[PDB]
Design an enzyme around this catalytic site. Sequence first.
Site, short mmCIF file in Angstrom:
data_model
loop_
_atom_site.label_atom_id
_atom_site.label_comp_id
_atom_site.label_asym_id
_atom_site.label_seq_id
_atom_site.Cartn_x
_atom_site.Cartn_y
_atom_site.Cartn_z
N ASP A 175 40.11 8.57 -21.53
CA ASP A 175 40.48 10.04 -22.70
C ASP A 175 40.42 9.50 -24.03
OD1 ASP A 175 42.84 11.72 -23.42
OD2 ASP A 175 44.22 10.32 -22.93
N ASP A 178 46.60 4.87 -24.95
CA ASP A 178 46.25 5.94 -24.53
C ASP A 178 45.20 5.53 -23.20
OD1 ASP A 178 48.67 7.36 -25.57
OD2 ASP A 178 47.56 8.56 -25.71
N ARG A 213 42.83 11.94 -31.91
CA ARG A 213 44.29 11.56 -31.60
C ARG A 213 44.70 9.87 -30.61
NH1 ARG A 213 42.56 15.61 -28.05
NH2 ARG A 213 42.40 14.54 -25.87
N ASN A 214 44.23 9.42 -30.39
CA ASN A 214 43.88 8.28 -29.42
C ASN A 214 44.16 7.30 -30.38
OD1 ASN A 214 45.00 9.74 -27.76
ND2 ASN A 214 43.69 10.62 -27.10
#
Lengths: 296, 292
Positions: A139, A157, A143-144
Amino acid sequence: PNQALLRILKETEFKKIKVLGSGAFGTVYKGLWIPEGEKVKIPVAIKELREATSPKANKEILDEAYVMASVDNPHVCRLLGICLTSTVQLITQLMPFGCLLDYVREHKDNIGSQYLLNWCVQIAKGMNYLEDRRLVHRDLAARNVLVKTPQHVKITDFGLAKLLVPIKWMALESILHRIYTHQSDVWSYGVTVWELMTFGSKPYDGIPASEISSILEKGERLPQPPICTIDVYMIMRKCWMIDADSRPKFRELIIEFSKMARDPQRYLVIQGDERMHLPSPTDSNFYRALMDEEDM
Amino acid sequence: QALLRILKETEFKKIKVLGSGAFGTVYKGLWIPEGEKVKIPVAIKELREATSPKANKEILDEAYVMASVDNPHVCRLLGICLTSTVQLITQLMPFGCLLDYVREHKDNIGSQYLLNWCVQIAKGMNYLEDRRLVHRDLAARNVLVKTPQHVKITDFGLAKLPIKWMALESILHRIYTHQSDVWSYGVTVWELMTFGSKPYDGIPASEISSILEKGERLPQPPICTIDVYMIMRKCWMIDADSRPKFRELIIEFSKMARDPQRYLVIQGDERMHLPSPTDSNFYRALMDEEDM
Ligand SMILES: Nc1ncnc2c1ncn2[C@@H]1O[C@H](COP(=O)(O)OP(=O)(O)NP(=O)(O)O)[C@@H](O)[C@H]1O
Ligand SMILES: Nc1ncnc2c1ncn2[C@@H]1O[C@H](COP(=O)(O)OP(=O)(O)NP(=O)(O)O)[C@@H](O)[C@H]1O
Ligand SMILES: [Mg+2]
Ligand SMILES: [Mg+2]
């Protein structure tokens, strides 16, 4: 996996006090952990996962968590503590700067090539560490990447997708055949670098995820970011090669983006880059001692 | 120089008033990175006597030194702001100082914890001796808690810019050496072993230098065996060159911390808190990333 690296929390040890945001996998609250028998309230980050679909047993979850808590790298966020109840609540270090994606969107005017190129280095190093640990993130996206300090980023994440789809960040093989390898994570890395070079643009804007596989299976990739040169885009375009083993390995990307950081005026072009904020030593130490402090 | 950040008075903003002392006042501050939307809790020190541009030059020069005390057990001066009055910026410690901590945890505090804080305080003090620095203001009140298992010494060099803790020679001749800090250390250790008691309580400060010469010393802490109080007392020798060196108290305390029941007798020591590995990694990862 050191079964002492993940601390089991009782729901009464911590409190939710704010909602920082939500994603496909859960909700993230800013939190406070009151140490048993202490008057202090320490800032944490609780992520409450949403069960669907469909649920793992309490023991299997622990095993995967003991693995997410066994992650030791300057650029990879580690699971501090967990909480099993009617829901499962993960506890990590609260990052006040928020995610990287939001950071560049906030600063699309203020970033220097020195910064961008360095984040690609840090993310790659972090992904490399995961790769060396035979762990597949699944993932990865801009954003991560949380921002610890403007010059220190980490990856969150991780391995959440294994517990419980980011189509526009997945390699082709993941979409079509659920194949997830260190090489698919490379593709996602390419998309992430794209996100960065475009100061928080949206991959395939307007194009529904429904048929992202289509455009991809027809050779369609993302626009060459305005500020990138050919040297750089050649790399991105290489991360998105339908042949998985054709894509760069993370260790090689570390070296690539490192070599580029040696003279960032060459591989990147920006409005005030000639005179935009480079991280000063006296400024960096201040950030590090007050907010960082971790070996790296 | 890269160790000391000259803060613009705009960047930081005082908020809560944590306390006041001999050298200045402390506020819970907020460092707002000039171009950022973040507010970051700091600790501000507003020196209680105002200052001029010339004194400033001397001040920064020490400030550079204070900014350079890089030890897990000694607090570092992160930033400074020269204005009408000088202001110092260090990490904020939510747990407060070690003095208030022992008094509000008398029954909770066990052998392992006390004997460890001592060791740490010795390590921090030994570091300052190794760097030829003189603290001058050592006391349980100056020893901050980062986590209940990791303490640090503050207000270093603040004096250069307290009677009941001072060594005899400090009181009679304003002399400050490492062995005179070793004295203040002895009192500090005493403060802890008595779970926070006041040194020479009932005996006016002006009359402290007197009782010392007649051979008066703080009583044996109720919980101390002679292996320990013998050390506290040795720190209070009139002959500075005769009291222990910091490198030695580290060893001697480390010896006892590897068998706590014997050297420290505390009621309910058997049930007392043991800092579990997990609970520790949790504190470190969350607060003190300095590998405690
Ligand atoms: N440790 C943290 N500190 C501060 N903010 C955090 C932290 N972890 C997560 N967040 C914020 O949580 C917000 C949304 O939560 P999240 O579950 O991460 O959604 P997401 O990651 O953007 N989407 P997803 O790809 O499905 O995980 C993000 O914008 C992050 O900025
Ligand atoms: N970094 C910090 N974090 C939290 N609290 C702090 C910090 N530094 C100082 N304090 C608080 O500041 C309060 C007042 O202390 P201060 O004004 O330095 O004099 P002091 O502690 O009595 N030592 P002294 O110089 O002998 O007066 C103390 O109660 C501390 O708890
Ligand atoms: Mg996220
Ligand atoms: Mg103090």
